[PDB]
DNA sequence: GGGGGAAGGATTCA
DNA sequence: CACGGAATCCTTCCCCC
């Protein structure tokens, strides 16, 4: 009963950037994300495997990777053409099941039941699915298969990288019994610990505690999809997924409460945005700050028709001004969100 | 009491 | 020193029948 098929593209930018500029396979690459503040400010958005090798990973400072890596290769991320990349691949999974579920920049998930027979086929299918893609694009993924979303994607993680693993019925069990709690999509830092104070540490003791006090702990609907696992119970469909918000935020040269100093970072990213929207218009509109001691702080507003960019522009102002008026730290970030769509 | 929303923020993942 | 971006869930305050 229902055989699911997850793919995840393997190091993905920095793979494209090596697709793109072969003399960098061999040598450790990372993909960056700099941000004016100062020479090397900014954070890395990812490195291949010959850099995470020696720790160099999505989320540490660049600063730090030029330390551990001082020769290795820097680029700045073109997020524009990994996009069209991952949607041509998108297009070439397609041509192997209708039900595809597009998780994000380069996961996909296959529903595959009424498609191919047992695991065997599933396997292959695999298989094909790769080489047809390494073939065609030149980037390697590794598949992950399993009875639902949540074990198909497990699959994957245990065989990263360019590799391909299936998870029988026999080994879920297994898992729901073995498997580290914290392992578990969905299931960040800061549940892991709630998790264990509560003596969860594996997906099967959920089913050994009383809901009201998970659900108490961990919010119900997390608590429905853990004790739902633990049951081997888990059955969310594979259903498209349309963008449901679009934004940008940008990082200021220095700190500040200045609204005149913000506001031109402010009308650069609505700008962008609304390039970004397209043919879309949108509802509602959020701006977003981040304070210097990295807090996030936003203030947003619906209206009851479309919002114009000039209506876009002078609303985000006052927003930008509520939240000063709200938070006394100087605003480090700034961004706006746009979303609630028409139609 | 409880439905229907909006807003601000928490948590997670890429 | 820690960047862009986006979804889902949760708490809370409201209006109101
Ligand atoms: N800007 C930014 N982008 C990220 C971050 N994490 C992931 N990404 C982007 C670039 C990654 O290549 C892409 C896929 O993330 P994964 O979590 O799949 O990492 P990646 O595919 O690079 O390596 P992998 O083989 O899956 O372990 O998403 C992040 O922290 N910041
Ligand atoms: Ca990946
Ligand atoms: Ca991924
Ligand atoms: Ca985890």
Same mark, same amino acid.
């Not at 503040?37 to 090397?40: A, G, K, S």
């Not at 039900?99 to 994000?104: F, G, H, L, N, T």
């Given at each position: 009963h229902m055989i699911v098929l997850f793919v995840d593209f393997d190091y993905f930018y920095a793979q494209v950037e090596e697709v793109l500029n %072969?003399? /960098? #396979?061999g040598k450790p690459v990372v993909v960056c994300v700099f941000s004016g503040?100062? =020479?090397?400010s900014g954070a890395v958005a990812t490195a291949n495997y010959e850099a995470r090798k020696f720790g160099v990973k999505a989320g540490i400072p660049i600063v730090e990777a030029k330390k551990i890596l001082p020769n290795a290769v820097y680029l700045p991320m073109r997020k524009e053409v990994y996009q069209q990349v991952s949607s041509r691949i998108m297009n070439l999974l397609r041509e192997y099941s209708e #039900? !595809? =579920? !597009? *998780?994000?920049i380069d996961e996909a998930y296959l529903d595959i039941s009424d498609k191919v027979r047992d695991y065997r086929e599933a396997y292959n299918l695999g298989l094909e699915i790769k080489n047809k893609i390494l073939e065609k694009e030149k980037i390697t993924v590794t598949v992950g298969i399993s009875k639902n979303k949540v074990f198909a994607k497990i699959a994957a993680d245990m065989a990263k990288p360019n590799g391909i693993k299936v998870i029988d019925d026999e080994e879920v069990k297994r898992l729901i019994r073995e /498997?580290? !709690? *914290?392992?578990? %999509? &969905?299931? &960040?830092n800061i549940t892991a610990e709630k998790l264990k104070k509560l003596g969860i540490n594996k997906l099967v003791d959920t089913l050994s505690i009383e809901f009201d006090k998970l659900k108490g702990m961990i919010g119900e609907a997390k608590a429905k999809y853990l004790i739902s696992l633990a049951r081997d119970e888990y059955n969310e469909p594979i259903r498209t997924r349309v963008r449901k918000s679009i934004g940008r935020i940008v990082t200021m040269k220095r700190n500040s409460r200045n609204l005149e100093e913000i506001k031109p970072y402010l009308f650069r990213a609505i700008e962008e945005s609304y390039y970004k929207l397209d043919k879309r218009i949108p509802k509602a509109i959020h701006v977003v700050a981040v304070t210097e001691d990295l807090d996030i702080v936003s203030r947003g507003r619906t209206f009851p028709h479309g919002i114009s960019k000039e209506t876009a522009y002078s609303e985000s102002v006052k927003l930008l001004q509520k939240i000063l008026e709200e938070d006394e730290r100087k605003i480090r970030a700034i961004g706006v969100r746009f979303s609630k769509f028409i139609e």
């Open positions: %072969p003399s /960098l #396979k503040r100062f =020479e090397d #039900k !595809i =579920e !597009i *998780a994000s /498997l580290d !709690i *914290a392992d578990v %999509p &969905g299931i &960040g």
